[PDB]
Amino acid sequence: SIYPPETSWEVNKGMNSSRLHKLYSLFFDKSSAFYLGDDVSVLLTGAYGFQSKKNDQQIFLFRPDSDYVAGYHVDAKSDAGWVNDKLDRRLSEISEFCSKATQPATFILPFVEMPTDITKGVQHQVLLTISYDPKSKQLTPTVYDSIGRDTYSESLSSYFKGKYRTTCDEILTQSIEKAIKSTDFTLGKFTRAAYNTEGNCGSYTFRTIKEVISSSAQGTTSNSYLTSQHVQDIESCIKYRNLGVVDIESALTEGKTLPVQLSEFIVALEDYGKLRSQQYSKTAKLTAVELLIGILNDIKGKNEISESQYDKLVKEVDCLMDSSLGKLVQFHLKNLGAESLQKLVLPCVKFD
Numbered sequence: 001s002i003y004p005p006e007t008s009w010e011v012n013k014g015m016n017s018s019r020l021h022k023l024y025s026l027f028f029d030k031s032s033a034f035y036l037g038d039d040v041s042v043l044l045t046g047a048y049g050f051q052s053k054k055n056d057q058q059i060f061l062f063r064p065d066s067d068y069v070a071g072y073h074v075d076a077k078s079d080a081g082w083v084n085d086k087l088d089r090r091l092s093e094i095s096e097f098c099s100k101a102t103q104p105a106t107f108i109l110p111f112v113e114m115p116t117d118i119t120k121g122v123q124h125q126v127l128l129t130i131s132y133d134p135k136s137k138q139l140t141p142t143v144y145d146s147i148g149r150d151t152y153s154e155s156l157s158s159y160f161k162g163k164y165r166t167t168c169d170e171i172l173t174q175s176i177e178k179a180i181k182s183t184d185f186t187l188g189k190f191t192r193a194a195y196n197t198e199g200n201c202g203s204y205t206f207r208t209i210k211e212v213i214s215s216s217a218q219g220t221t222s223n224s225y226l227t228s229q230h231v232q233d234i235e236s237c238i239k240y241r242n243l244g245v246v247d248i249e250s251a252l253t254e255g256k257t258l259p260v261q262l263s264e265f266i267v268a269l270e271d272y273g274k275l276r277s278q279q280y281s282k283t284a285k286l287t288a289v290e291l292l293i294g295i296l297n298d299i300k301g302k303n304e305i306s307e308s309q310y311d312k313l314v315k316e317v318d319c320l321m322d323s324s325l326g327k328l329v330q331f332h333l334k335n336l337g338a339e340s341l342q343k344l345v346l347p348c349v350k351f352d
């Protein structure tokens, strides 16, 4: 129920559902390349609801989930594959919703796509979106894929497209139809949108989620719209803060940003500490970290740092600004409104 600060995460380990959830925190950080002043909160299980400013459109964004997964068979001789019953549930729950809905909606599932034949557990973060139009009773699915490929040189010949499946599209489209077995709705043409080394897929997905929402509010890129600011945001979030799930829930339902508490800085430091002990000498950075954690706890206590503790901190300034540790300290200091550690700690100090 707590997404801890994964220092040293750096956007290539790849995403996982927890991280992605944690990234959802950015949707209402005004100072964020992912900010959404296009949606309001609305007053459907497993999804957060969003009203459109500037529109009639309704937007449901599902909480990411370790079970939102489809497994396809690369061999075409094989059964096309499977979907978790949970994803199938959500699909059905979506159609059940839409049958009663009067205002048009767009549904957003981050899910994972993977080959089951191959022993290699190649799990691919990928995005499903189902829009529903009640006047048409139309339900159009799209899958947004971040490994665009399609290279002329490494294109699958049609015949071999017969021999080999590159994606779950078969099984997925099957699952959607099953949800609609009533033949109560028209399913629009299932398209797959592709674009855009491999480990980047998930962060792309998250960006797309933003886009899909913004577009939805408004309607309707040569390269690198995954802006570095975007990446700085994602990295700093996954890497440096300590979020509870309750916090994120509350954030997305009350439409509030989630300011960085001091405890977040403290935890971040401690985790940095553990990880660093595993790998300026090591004992040096560990002494710095220790000392600093102590000071911040004493602040937390509301106690005044001793002048002595401060002078202690002053050489550790050099040791705590260095590189990685430095960037952690820098993130949090940005988010506490302090120019330096010396600045932050200078008040509430008891002088001899």
Ligand SMILES: [Ba+2]
Binding pocket: 082, 083, 084, 085, 088
């Ligand atoms: Ba199933």
